[PDB]
Structure 1
């Protein structure tokens, strides 16, 4: 089966928002936007501008594989934890996301050559309120939990879809001052605009295939190409070969 995710989002924020108060001769006090005079007498009115925007994009594609006989069940499940390097070694912290997967099946053969199976699958992370810093969520993407319960049959060696989910969204707001936000000269200094847009697909595929043959080439030649090139080969040692040699050829 084929998990696949696509995420894409962009967001912009621009504009000001004002507050504060003035005073006249200890006779009258004018305040803007809930600024209580009971905390301030001479602190004049302030502003606050925000400016930030970004574009986020992330993919993740994962696949489990497993085989059985026909008319017998089987279970596969898996969960790794993926760490990422928060900036700082003495100023020390970590953040991490577990990524769980589960699948159980029950296949059989048909007469004309197609395969019929019985699917319960799961995928995702557990809901964790974490990764407090801005890029800490950005480091490892999130994929929601999902669950299917479906029998589905498919012709031999080809691929059929089993379920999915898409989503599109916007957001638009223009926050401003009523009178002064429409004059042509500096009227756009009193705006506060913040768009937002994200759009995400995610779909579960499936494809079986029939298998009758042993692996070509052999597995003992696979790992001996791994260990002599990843730099962990351990047959040179004249202290440890005296007990590995009981263990490689019988």
Structure 2
């Protein structure tokens, strides 16, 4: 007499569940021309539940069932990293903290990923530093068919910063709000009992990068020992 099934999520569908339950029943064996029971094979049922997360409440009685699934995933992150290098004026410095990973490529060339900062200052005598800068922050994130993909975010610009003060190089601000729904249609609109017939998925996401840079000028022999001593 029917089913109702929704493919949103992450929300495991009740059709392909109700099969995996029945393929899990013990099959009563006999062999003639014994009374073992092969029991089940849960390979199928445990594959649904492999990545599943969050509630599934049910009524399974007489093969008819009502399965109410709900979850709320909520994450956060905070990161602050601050590489720094010391050069003479007009000379370029390179600073990498990372790892050196092979790329396929062709023949296996050898590629470097990680925090990288390459800067070449010149003091402009207004006491203002004038960088030529390449920031980069990479990491190995998972694979692809034929190789590794690298998460990578880099910016190479030229900025002009005062001696002791902080200029912003770059940035990103990224928002999203998804939504989805599914319903019967006509019954999903009742203001009370509508929710029995719907399957909703919402999403919200946010990210902020910033990259700042602060030069400092060490002129005296005593100025180099003020920063490097603290």
> How far did 1:148 drift?
1.6
Alignment root-mean-square deviation, CA: 3.6
> How far did 1:14 drift?
11
Tell me, yes or no, if structure 1 residue 51 matches structure 2 residue 70. Answer: yes
Mapped to 1, the partners of 2:80 and 2:161 lie a distance apart of: 22
Tell me, yes or no, if structure 1 residue 173 matches structure 2 residue 183. Answer: no
Q: Which residue of 2 aligns with 1:215?
A: 225
Whose RCO is larger (CA < 8 A, sep 6+)? Answer: 1
> How far did 1:15 drift?
8.6
- Which range is displaced more, 53-62 or 175-184? 175-184
Q: Once the two structures are superposed, what CA deviation does each residue of 1:22-67 show, in whole Å capped at 9, x if it has no partner?
A: xxxxxxxxxxxxxxxxxxxxx9554443211032111000001111
Mapped to 2, the partners of 1:115 and 1:145 lie a distance apart of: 27
Instruction: Return closer, same or farther for 1:54/1:159 CA change in 2, 3 Å cut-off.
Output: same
> How far did 1:115 drift?
0.7
Instruction: Return closer, same or farther for 1:215/1:146 CA change in 2, 3 Å cut-off.
Output: same
Check whether the contact 1:102–1:122 (CA below 8 A) recurs between aligned residues: yes
Q: Given the two structures, how large is their TM-score scaled by the length of structure 2?
A: 0.58
Q: Given the two structures, how large is their TM-score scaled by the length of structure 1?
A: 0.54
Instruction: Return closer, same or farther for 1:110/1:152 CA change in 2, 3 Å cut-off.
Output: same
Instruction: Note the 1:1-250 alignment, pairs <5 A.
Output: 19=15, 44-79=63-98, 100-128=114-142, 144-183=151-190, 186-211=193-218, 212=220, 213=222, 214-215=224-225
Check whether the contact 1:17–1:48 (CA below 8 A) recurs between aligned residues: no
- Which range is displaced more, 185-194 or 161-170? 185-194
Mapped to 2, the partners of 1:154 and 1:216 lie a distance apart of: 21
Mapped to 2, the partners of 1:170 and 1:218 lie a distance apart of: 47
Q: Secondary structure at the match of 1:53?
A: coil
Q: Secondary structure at the match of 1:61?
A: coil
Between Structure 1 and Structure 2, which shows a larger proportion of strand residues?
1
Mapped to 2, the partners of 1:192 and 1:127 lie a distance apart of: 32
The runs of 5 or more residues in structure 2 that have no matched partner are 1-8, 19-61, 100-112, 144-149
- Which range is displaced more, 186-195 or 162-171? 186-195
Mapped to 1, the partners of 2:97 and 2:186 lie a distance apart of: 60
Q: Once the two structures are superposed, what CA deviation does each residue of 1:62-110 show, in whole Å capped at 9, x if it has no partner?
A: 0011111111111100027xxxxxxxxxxxxxxxxxx810111111111
> How far did 1:207 drift?
0.8
Mapped to 1, the partners of 2:90 and 2:84 lie a distance apart of: 18
Q: Secondary structure at the match of 1:58?
A: coil
